[PDB]
Ligand binder design. Structure first.
Ligand SMILES: Nc1ncnc2c1ncn2[C@@H]1O[C@H](COP(=O)(O)OP(=O)(O)OP(O)(O)=S)[C@@H](O)[C@H]1O
Ligand SMILES: Nc1ncnc2c1ncn2[C@@H]1O[C@H](COP(=O)(O)OP(=O)(O)OP(O)(O)=S)[C@@H](O)[C@H]1O
Ligand SMILES: Nc1ncnc2c1ncn2[C@@H]1O[C@H](COP(=O)(O)OP(=O)(O)OP(O)(O)=S)[C@@H](O)[C@H]1O
Ligand SMILES: [Mg+2]
Ligand SMILES: [Mg+2]
Ligand SMILES: [Mg+2]
Lengths: 293, 315, 327, 335
């Protein structure tokens, strides 16, 4: 096509899955679209405290063309509600849709989405908006100061998130500890109307693939030291829908109070970065210690 | 970093709170005894109500403070559902405490609580008074519904005197080793208008700007309370003097006309010298000028005409 | 990009050194940031004095060029109800810095437009999270701020811009442009500014437009008055002299001629005459009372429209009747 | 020809380009050179009715973009639209944040196409203070891609911050001195035959409103065409159409006022209100008669000027015409 960017696919599941994953960040707000030869990424942020980035690589599309030469990437901003409503109305006959094509012709042009059926094609153009001064790259994990890392099965984490949601969890605490004899302890401690509750992940290489505590430098492994991260459940729970489709989840917490969750479902990949609370109250610390000891 | 002095020097014990000597002494008596009843603490901003309630709770509950205190303010959810679930469950909790000690529910800024929540609080107070006690903190005691007031001891905090403010300022200065002069402390106290929070903020600002707390240095940053300027403007025996005050001290300093008229109404309400007829006529003229300002004509000429009418009435 | 911007925005100060007129406030805030002891701030002042510019420049200085990542700015264009305070502001103030870069900053611009309930909810958010976060509240009308919020903020007053600062900024703009301003034009611009830099910049841009060849044409007072459509001081003096000395017919004719020469509006003539009369030495004070009351009434009536000729005749009659007292 | 004759003369002869706008050169020059400078600021047009504010902004928008591009670069809102605080915070803000649309090759070839949009808020004085406050930082932040144009008759109804933000353009009243050329051109286009000074009389009666003058000219032309006598329109016909009270009736009123008898004045006013004369016109004519008369003294003129101002201000508040007129006449008779 003559457009600067044009990608067409025959798998409508990826698009609807991406919209489903982006929904928990607000049904009425902005979404940033990054386009480059590598692929197309959707980015959303909430309250300068949480961020989600979902990537769609070239392989997911049966055709992918990025003809821009002046710039190696293109940035645009759209309204999530517009896309949601348009797709919901257009995707009513999901059995008949055979092709979906996204297109963009640079700054000043709309983001074009076309659903192509056997004999009927529906073309929608979404108006674009100026991108906010806030930089998505601002909230990122310091790769050189990882406090701890862990690998978890998607099903178990999703079930734990469901349990936390169903009890009205208000505050969440991620507890990670390592000892000798390949002993690992990863747990989520919730403060809710029920009081303090705990969900412990088994120390087996079936759900908790690996856990390591790096002493805040990503290099030296230390045993007997517990890393505790305090988060508001309002932000922590936003990864539930991404975990629903997740095959594996990688948690990485740094010393600056940043938690990164990498979710793997050729495929859809998600990265959620969240900030932790300033400090943990004495009562919460005592209750966590009592629960873990 | 370095905390602002207002929070850095927040009193942590009841013995460090200045002013309201009788009320603070009674709070100390309650703390040493234990039999704390439901209480309401009312007063103007920045006089120590929140600090007093927190210090009393800490002294009463000791190490059990974490499990024996439930604090809620206007920044938290405090609707009827909160009363139905969170406060009810806290009051139902069985906590072993030393004899004469009860759990404490602190409701800061209780005035802002909704009517439904306040009405719901009646039954929980009736049912769980044997193990739980309520401390309301507010600025207007009348904004708490009467059925709740009926169960509590009232405690009204008065404005701090210059002596108490000076004593606390001297303690802070000694702790910080700040160089000052008597006129500077006088200016700080005069500009604080009885608010200790403002006094501390102004002292910190002056120290940061110049270090030495003199009168001129204080008045470079801090401004005399404009209510006093408005009172002087209203009480001037000459029309030209009132106009000169309005021009030099208020208009050219950047004070908005709406603020000037609202302050004029507030001040005229409290003029003890004037007669009732003159006062009510001045109020009428101020109201008419306020109506004109709200419509968009917020000009200096309107305020000058208001002053001319007030002077005419004084004659 | 900046070239296409209106001058009021193209000349927005970037650093604190570019802010003029507020020497005391700038000095104090610069020393506070130098020691890193910034308290909760209130910037109170009239329009176009540098409040928003000053706070943005301070944020830039504190956080360098990456201030947009750890500063939460909200204004009247955003909804700031009690729910917003409870959720968004609360979560921002209760979370760690991006890279442990000291404390976070929340700017509440035009906070006088916030509701009482939201301001009440703000009290404990400000108090509890003071260690990690600092608040800045900007306002033009203090009576809209609750006493509790005012008590919590260190107050700084932005005065109307002095003449010297306006002259310096005008010189900077003239150098940046290829423009030439006469001293009389500068005096007229300062007089009409009333301490607002925005008006100065807008009038300067319009004057540059008015010039046929700005590369060599110089702005004179006549250009300023043409652009603003305002009366000249000579016009005001002539009208006042005719009112105070000439008979009714002559005064009416003089007012009509002066207004029709350049299409002057009556309100500006009244304002200029009031400025002139404020300095008059009157032996009878009752004259001032009559002048002020009648002219304020005429201004209020004009604000709603009405008959222009009747209003002008009313101004003439009011001045004459008031000055009959001096007799 | 019938289609071109489907429009009232005010709409028919609305200026198409900025060159057609008359008597407002002080602002038209700035707006015109903005086409080359591409430095359009936020604007606040203010002035009395029928002076050419809406026409000027429409002509500017047409000149800047063109018939096609305009639709994507203009957002117009007026008193007929809902403009609550929520509207300002959502719709106006979204448009102000919208990316600048890409012009076509034809548009670039034919029009300057500045890289920003325009939001026109006509009758801005009807908006509430809070809604106006909601516009401040929206205008400041997105000035790189959006420019605002507020239009009003009562500038005092605009909050001070918005007035400071906007560059102000006062539109002057259109009288017989500065607007006669346009009215003469309109009369020549429609082949209106009027006696010398008729256009002067229309413009003096209109009192700064060219729209009213054009409507009066159209009414006179219709009357003359219906008569079909081929004769020139007369000033008396114009005064009759305008609702001006005949000089003899005014003389009778003045004589009654001079007599001073309350009952006679009341009876005459009761009979005079039968004809349905508008009290505003009568008050204006009485002001003209008395203020310019050389048979009265200075104190009389001062007192009558204040009385006339009070009566006119009361009438502006939609008061009851008979009562106000009778009160004014009784007061004058007592001078
Ligand atoms: N009596 C006092 N003695 C010493 N410091 C005081 C006193 N009152 C206020 N302060 C100081 O100002 C700060 C605030 O005091 P508060 O107890 O919060 O006043 P407040 O009456 O509760 O204000 P409101 O009603 O919540 S606006 C304290 O941390 C102290 O540093
Ligand atoms: N002290 C100043 N020094 C230099 N320019 C100023 C100054 N104050 C205002 N300006 C100019 O006028 C423009 C507006 O300045 P602002 O800081 O936004 O004024 P403001 O006090 O915030 O107005 P309000 O209260 O929001 S109506 C700036 O872009 C500057 O170009
Ligand atoms: N300066 C003008 N030049 C030519 N025609 C004008 C002019 N002003 C008014 N008119 C005529 O009167 C009609 C109305 O002009 P407008 O631009 O609508 O005046 P206006 O100032 O917008 O009136 P308001 O403020 O909405 S009551 C135009 O279509 C023209 O026919
Ligand atoms: Mg308090
Ligand atoms: Mg501002
Ligand atoms: Mg119009």
């Amino acid at each position: 096509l003559a457009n600067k960017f044009s990608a067409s696919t025959v798998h409508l599941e990826h698009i609807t899955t991406a919209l489903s994953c982006l929904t928990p960040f607000g049904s009425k707000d902005d979404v940033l679209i990054f386009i480059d030869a590598d692929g197309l990424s959707f980015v959303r942020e909430n309250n300068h405290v949480i961020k989600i980035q979902l990537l769609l690589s070239r392989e997911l599309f049966m055709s992918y063309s990025y003809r821009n030469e002046t710039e190696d990437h293109m940035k645009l901003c759209v309204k999530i509600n517009h896309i949601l409503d348009s797709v919901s109305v257009m995707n009513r006959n999901s059995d008949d849709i055979v092709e979906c094509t996204l297109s963009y012709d640079g700054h000043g042009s709309p983001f074009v989405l076309i659903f192509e059926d056997s004999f009927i094609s529906e073309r929608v153009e979404y108006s674009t908006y100026l991108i906010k001064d806030f930089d998505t790259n601002g909230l990122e994990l310091d790769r050189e100061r990882i406090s701890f890392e862990a690998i978890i099965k998607g099903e178990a984490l999703h079930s734990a998130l469901k349990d936390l949601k169903e009890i009205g969890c208000k505050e969440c605490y991620v507890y990670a500890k390592t000892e000798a004899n390949d002993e690992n302890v990863f747990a989520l401690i919730s403060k809710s109307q029920l009081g303090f509750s705990k969900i412990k992940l088994p120390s087996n290489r079936s759900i908790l693939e690996k856990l390591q505590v790096f002493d805040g430098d990503s290099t030296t492994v230390i045993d007997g030291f517990a890393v505790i991260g305090f988060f508001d459940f309002t932000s922590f729970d936003k990864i539930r829908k991404s975990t629903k489709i997740a095959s594996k989840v990688l948690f990485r917490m740094d010393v600056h109070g940043v938690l990164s969750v990498n979710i793997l479902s050729p495929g859809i990949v998600i990265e959620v970065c969240m900030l932790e609370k300033e400090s943990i109250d004495e009562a919460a610390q005592t209750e966590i210690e009592l629960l873990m000891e | 970093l370095q905390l602002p002095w207002v929070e850095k020097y927040r009193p942590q014990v009841l013995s460090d709170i200045v002013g309201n000597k009788e009320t603070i002494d009674r709070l100390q008596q309650i703390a040493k005894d234990g039999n704390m009843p439901h209480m309401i603490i009312s007063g103007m901003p920045g006089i120590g109500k929140t600090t007093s309630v927190h210090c009393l709770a800490h002294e009463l509950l000791g190490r059990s403070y974490a499990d024996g205190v439930l604090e809620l303010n206007a920044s938290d959810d405090r609707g009827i559902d909160v009363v139905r679930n969170q406060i009810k469950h806290f009051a139902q909790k069985k906590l072993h405490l030393p004899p004469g000690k009860h759990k404490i529910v602190i409701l800061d800024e209780a005035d802002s609580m909704t009517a439904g929540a306040q009405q719901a609080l009646r039954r929980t107070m009736e049912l769980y008074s044997n193990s739980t006690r309520f401390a309301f903190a507010c600025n207007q005691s009348n904004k708490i519904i009467e059925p709740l007031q009926s169960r509590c001891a009232i405690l009204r905090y008065s404005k701090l005197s210059d002596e108490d403010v000076l004593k606390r300022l001297l303690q802070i200065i000694k702790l910080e080793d700040v160089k000052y002069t008597n006129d500077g402390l006088e200016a700080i106290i005069f500009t604080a208008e009885g608010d200790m929070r403002q006094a501390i903020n102004n002292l910190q600002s002056t120290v940061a700007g110049h270090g030495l707390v003199n009168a001129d240095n204080v008045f470079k940053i801090v401004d005399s309370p404009h209510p006093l300027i408005v009172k002087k403007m209203l009480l001037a025996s000459n029309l030209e003097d009132s106009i000169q005050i309005l021009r030099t001290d208020l208009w050219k300093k950047g004070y908005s006309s709406i603020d000037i008229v609202t302050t004029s109404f507030r001040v005229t309400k409290n003029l003890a010298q004037v007669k009732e007829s003159v006062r009510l006529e001045m109020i009428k003229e101020i109201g008419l000028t306020h109506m004109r300002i709200l419509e968009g004509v917020g000009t200096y000429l309107q305020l000058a005409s208001m002053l001319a009418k007030i002077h005419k009435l004084n004659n | 990009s900046k070239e296409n911007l209106p001058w009021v925005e193209k000349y927005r100060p970037e650093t604190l050194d570019e802010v003029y007129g507020q020497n005391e406030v700038i000095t104090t805030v610069r020393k506070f940031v130098d020691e890193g002891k910034l308290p909760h701030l209130l910037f109170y002042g009239p329009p176009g004095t540098g409040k928003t510019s000053t706070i943005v420049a301070l944020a830039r200085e504190i956080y360098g060029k990456n201030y947009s990542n750890m500063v939460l700015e909200l204004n009247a264009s955003d909804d700031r109800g009690i729910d917003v305070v409870r959720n968004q502001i609360k979560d921002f103030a209760s979370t760690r810095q991006i890279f442990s870069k000291g404390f976070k900053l929340i700017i509440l611009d035009e906070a006088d437009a916030m509701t009482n309930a939201a301001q009440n909810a703000l009290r404990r958010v400000i108090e509890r999270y003071t260690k990690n976060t600092r608040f800045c509240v900007l306002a033009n009308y203090a009576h809209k701020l609750t006493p509790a919020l005012l008590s919590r903020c260190t107050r700084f007053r932005f005065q109307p811009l002095p003449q010297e600062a306006i002259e310096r900024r005008i010189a900077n703009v003239l150098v940046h442009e290829k423009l030439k301003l006469s001293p009389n034009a500068e005096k007229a611009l300062i007089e009409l500014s009333n301490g607002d830099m925005r008006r100065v910049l807008n009038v300067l841009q319009s004057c540059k437009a008015t010039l046929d060849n700005p590369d060599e044409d110089e702005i004179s007072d006549d250009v300023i008055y043409e652009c603003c459509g305002a009366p000249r001081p000579s016009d005001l003096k002539a009208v006042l002299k005719s009112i105070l000395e000439d008979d009714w017919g002559t005064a009416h004719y003089t007012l009509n001629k002066v207004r029709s020469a350049k299409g002057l509006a009556l309100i500006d003539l009244i304002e200029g005459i009031v400025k002139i009369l404020e300095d008059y030495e009157l032996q009878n004070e009752e004259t001032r009372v009559h002048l002020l009351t009648k002219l304020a009434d005429i201004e209020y009536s004009i604000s709603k429209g009405g008959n222009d000729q009747i209003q002008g005749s009313a101004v003439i009659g009011a001045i004459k009747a008031s000055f009959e007292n001096e007799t | 020809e019938q289609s071109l004759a489907q429009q009232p003369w005010v709409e028919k002869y609305r200026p198409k380009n900025l060159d057609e706008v008359t008597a407002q050169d002080h602002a038209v020059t700035v707006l015109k050179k903005t086409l080359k400078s591409a430095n359009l600021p936020h604007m606040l047009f203010y002035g009395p009715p029928g002076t050419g504010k809406t026409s000027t902004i429409l002509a500017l928008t047409k000149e800047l973009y063109g018939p096609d591009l305009m639709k994507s670069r203009i957002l117009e809102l007026n008193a007929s639209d809902e403009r609550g605080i929520s509207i300002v915070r959502e719709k106006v803000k979204n448009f102000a944040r919208l990316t600048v649309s890409k012009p076509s090759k034809h548009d670039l070839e034919n029009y300057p196409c500045p890289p920003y949009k325009i939001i026109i808020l006509d009758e801005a004085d009807s908006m509430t203070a809070d809604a106006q406050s909601a516009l401040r930082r929206t205008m400041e932040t997105y000035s790189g891609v959006t420019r605002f144009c507020l239009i009003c008759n009562y500038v005092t109804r605009i909050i001070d911050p918005l007035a400071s933000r906007c560059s102000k353009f006062r539109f002057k009243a259109l009288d017989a001195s500065n607007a006669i050329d346009r009215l003469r051109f309109i009369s020549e286009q429609e082949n209106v035959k009027c006696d010398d000074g008729v256009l002067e009389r229309i413009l003096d009666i209109s009192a700064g409103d060219l729209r009213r003058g054009i409507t009066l000219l159209q009414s006179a032309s219709k009357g003359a065409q219906y008569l079909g006598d081929g004769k020139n329109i007369t000033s008396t016909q114009v005064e009759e159409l305008a609702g001006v009270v005949p000089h003899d009736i005014l003389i009778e009123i003045v004589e009654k006022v001079k007599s001073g008898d309350f009952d006679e004045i009341k009876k005459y006013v009761n009979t005079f209100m039968k004809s349905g004369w508008s009290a505003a016109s009568v008050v204006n004519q009485l002001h003209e008669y008395y203020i310019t008369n050389d048979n009265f003294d200075t104190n009389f003129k001062n007192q009558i000027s204040w009385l006339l101002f009070t009566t006119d201000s009361r009438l502006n508040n939609g008061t009851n015409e008979h009562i106000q007129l009778l009160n004014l006449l009784v007061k004058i008779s007592q001078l």
